[PDB]
Design a protein around this ligand. Structure first.
Ligand SMILES: OC[C@H]1O[C@H](O)[C@H](O)[C@@H](O)[C@@H]1O
Ligand SMILES: [Ca+2]
Length: 559
C-alpha cells in the first residue's frame, strides 16, 4: 500500500536567497534574482522550491532572526516582488515552500521590545524571563551560537532565554496568546497561496518545566535535551488542528537534536502533526557531539547504516526528505565525495544518483546540480557566520583549541561553505552580481558554472536533469521499498528499490580504483537505466559489474 501525493513524488530545490542571484548590484541575492531564474530551474526539472527566510530581519543569522513576520526582508525586495514570485511559479506549475521560524524572533521584533520593557507589560510572558542564581545565569544552559543560553537584561534585572543568538530570544509556546498570534501569522502567508511550510527547529518549542540544570552528560549533548519538552506534540498537533489542516500544503519539520527513534511522532500521518521529516542523522554523521565544529573520520558502512535506519524509522506511516547538504552544512561533493579535479564531476553525479533514488522527497540545494564545492577559507575573518564566531570565542579565545586546528576543522564543517554565491557563468563574480558579493565567490567558478553546463550533455547539471526525468518515469524509484545489499561494505554502495515485480538496483563505487562487484543470490541485470563513468558494457543477464572509480548506475533487475 502507498498513498501517493504531490509532495512525496516532488523533487525540491532549496534556494538560499542571499546567495542565489543579486539583481541590483548591492552584492546580496534577492527575490527578483529568483524570479529571473525560474526557467533555469524548470529546465533542471524541479517542481517545488523551498526558500530560506525571506522576512524583515536585522540579519544576525541571515533571516533566522525575524523582526517582522509580515514584511519582506529589505535586501530581498518588496511584497510586490514576493507576490510576483508566487505568480510566476504558478505560471510554471511550481509550488513554493517557505521557512517558518517560530521557535524565536529577533530581539527587535515588536513583541520582544514590549516584553523587555518590564514585568508589567502585556508581552512579558511572550518570552522566558528568569532571575539569576547567585549573580549567575538561571542555569547552566549553553547556546548553540556561543556562551550561555541566558542573557541578563538591565532594565528588569531578569535573564531571557535564547537557544540561538542573544538576538534570537525564544518565544513562550506555553502561553496560549503566543500560539494564537503565531497561527494568525501562518494564515497571513498561507492565504497567499503558498504550498508548503518548513518548520525551523520545530522540536524545541516546548521548554523543560522549571529549567533545571543539565547534568555533565546532558551538557555534552544539550541539542537533544532541548527537544525533550513535555508538550511539543500537543503544540504541533494543535497547530495542525487550528491551522495546517485547513489549507492544502506540505509541511516539513526540521528536527535537529531529536533522536531518530523519537522522530516518527512528528510525521506519522495518523498523528496529524507534520508531513515530511528533515532528520540530521546522516548529514552530521561525522560531527563530534561535544565539540560541534569538529569533524571525525566516517566510513561508507557508517553512512549506509544511517540511510537504512532513517528509511526504516519512517516506516509505513511517516515520510522522509532526503538531502546531502543545505545552508547549514558543507557541500555534498566535498563532504561525501571527492572534490578534486580528477573526481569532482563523477562523484557529484554519483551522489545525485544516490539522492534521486531514495524512498523520500529529495531536496537539491542550490549549486549542488553544478558540483559546487566547499570554499577555501584561510583566516577566521574570511567567515561571516555568527555560529563560527561563537565557536571561535568558546574554544579558541579561551585557549582550549589552537586557532590553526580549529580552522582545519571549520574549513570542512562551516555553514558558510554552502553560502558562497551561486556560480552562474564564467564572467566577473560568476555573474552573480554587478557589484561586490557579500561573501567572496569560489575561484573555481571559472571551471564550475551553469553556463558551461546547461548545454553540455555530459555536464553534472544535465545528469541531474536526466536522473530527475528517470525518477519521474519509474514509480519504484519514489515508492519502492529500500533494501541495502550489504550494510558492511565500505567500497560499493548497492541497494534495491522494489514495487511488486519491478525491481531496480543502484550501484555506486565509492573507491578511486576499479572494483568488481558480483551481485548476490540470483540477481541479474535486465536493463541499464543510466550509468556515469561506465567503461565495461552491461549485457542482458550480467551477474557482475566491473565498476570504474566513482562509477554510478541504476539497473532494472530480471524477475
Ligand atoms: O532548523 C535550525 C535552524 O536554526 C537556526 O535558527 C539556524 O541558524 C538555521 O540555519 C537552522 O536551519
Ligand atoms: Ca540585491
Amino acid at each position: 500500500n502507498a498513498l501517493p501525493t504531490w509532495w512525496k513524488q516532488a523533487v525540491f530545490y532549496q534556494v538560499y536567497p542571499r546567495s542565489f542571484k543579486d539583481t541590483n548590484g548591492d552584492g546580496i541575492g534577492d527575490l527578483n534574482g529568483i524570479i529571473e531564474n525560474l526557467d533555469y530551474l524548470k529546465k533542471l526539472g524541479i517542481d517545488a522550491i523551498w526558500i530560506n527566510p525571506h522576512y524583515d530581519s536585522p540579519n544576525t543569522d541571515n533571516g533566522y532572526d525575524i523582526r517582522d513576520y509580515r514584511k519582506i526582508m529589505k535586501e530581498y525586495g518588496t511584497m510586490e516582488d514576493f507576490d510576483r514570485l508566487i505568480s510566476e511559479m504558478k505560471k510554471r506549475n511550481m509550488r513554493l515552500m517557505i521557512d517558518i521560524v517560530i521557535n524565536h524572533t529577533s530581539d527587535q521584533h515588536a513583541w520582544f521590545v514590549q516584553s523587555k520593557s518590564g514585568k508589567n507589560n502585556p508581552y512579558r510572558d511572550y518570552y522566558f524571563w528568569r532571575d539569576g542564581k547567585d549573580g549567575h545565569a538561571p542555569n547552566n544552559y549553553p547556546s548553540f551560537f556561543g556562551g550561555s543560553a541566558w542573557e541578563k537584561d538591565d532594565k528588569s534585572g531578569q535573564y531571557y532565554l535564547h537557544y540561538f543568538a542573544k538576538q534570537q530570544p525564544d518565544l513562550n509556546w506555553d502561553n496560549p496568546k503566543v500560539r494564537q498570534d503565531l497561527y494568525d501569522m501562518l494564515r497571513f502567508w498561507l492565504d497567499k497561496g503558498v504550498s508548503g511550510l518548513r518548520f525551523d527547529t520545530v522540536a524545541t518549542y516546548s521548554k523543560i518545566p522549571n529549567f533545571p540544570d543539565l547534568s555533565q552528560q546532558q551538557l555534552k549533548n544539550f541539542a537533544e535535551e532541548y527537544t525533550k519538552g513535555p508538550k511539543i506534540h500537543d503544540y504541533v498537533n494543535e497547530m495542525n488542528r487550528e491551522v495546517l489542516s485547513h489549507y492544502d500544503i506540505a509541511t516539513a519539520g526540521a528536527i535537529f537534536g531529536v533522536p531518530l527513534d523519537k522522530s516518527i511522532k512528528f510525521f506519522d500521518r495518523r498523528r496529524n502533526e507534520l508531513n515530511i521529516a528533515f532528520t540530521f542523522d546522516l548529514i552530521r554523521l561525522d560531527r563530534d557531539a561535544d565539540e560541534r565544529w569538529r569533524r571525525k573520520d566516517w566510513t561508507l558502512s557508517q553512512f549506509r547504516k544511517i540511510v537504512d535506519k532513517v528509511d526504516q524509522t519512517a516506516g509505513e506511516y511517516g515520510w522522509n526528505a532526503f538531502f546531502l547538504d543545505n545552508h547549514d552544512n558543507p557541500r555534498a561533493v566535498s563532504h561525501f565525495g571527492d572534490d578534486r579535479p580528477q573526481w569532482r564531476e563523477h562523484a557529484a553525479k554519483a551522489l545525485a544518483t544516490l539522492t534521486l533514488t531514495q524512498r523520500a522527497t529529495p531536496f537539491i540545494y542550490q549549486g549542488s546540480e553544478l558540483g559546487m564545492t566547499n570554499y577555501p577559507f584561510k583566516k577566521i575573518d574570511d567567515f561571516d557566520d555568527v555560529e563560527v564566531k561563537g565557536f571561535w570565542q568558546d574554544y579558541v579565545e579561551t585557549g582550549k583549541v589552537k586557532a590553526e586546528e580549529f580552522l582545519q576543522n571549520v574549513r570542512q564543517t562551516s555553514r558558510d561553505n554552502s553560502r558562497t554565491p551561486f556560480q552562474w557563468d564564467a564572467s566577473k563574480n560568476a555573474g552573480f552580481t554587478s557589484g561586490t558579493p557579500w561573501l567572496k565567490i569560489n575561484p573555481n567558478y571559472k571551471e564550475i558554472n551553469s553556463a558551461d553546463q546547461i548545454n553540455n550533455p555530459n555536464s553534472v547539471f544535465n545528469y541531474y536533469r536526466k536522473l530527475i526525468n528517470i525518477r519521474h518515469d519509474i514509480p519504484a524509484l519514489t515508492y519502492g521499498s529500500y533494501i541495502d545489499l550489504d550494510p558492511d561494505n565500505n567500497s560499493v554502495y548497492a541497494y534495491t528499490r522494489t514495487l511488486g515485480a519491478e525491481k531496480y538496483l543502484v550501484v555506486i563505487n565509492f573507491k578511486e580504483e576499479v572494483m568488481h562487484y558480483t551481485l548476490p543470490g540470483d540477481l541479474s541485470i535486465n536493463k541499464v537505466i543510466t550509468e556515469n563513468n561506465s567503461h565495461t558494457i552491461v549485457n542482458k543477464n550480467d551477474r557482475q559489474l566491473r565498476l570504474e572509480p566513482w562509477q554510478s548506475g541504476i539497473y532494472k533487475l530480471n524477475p
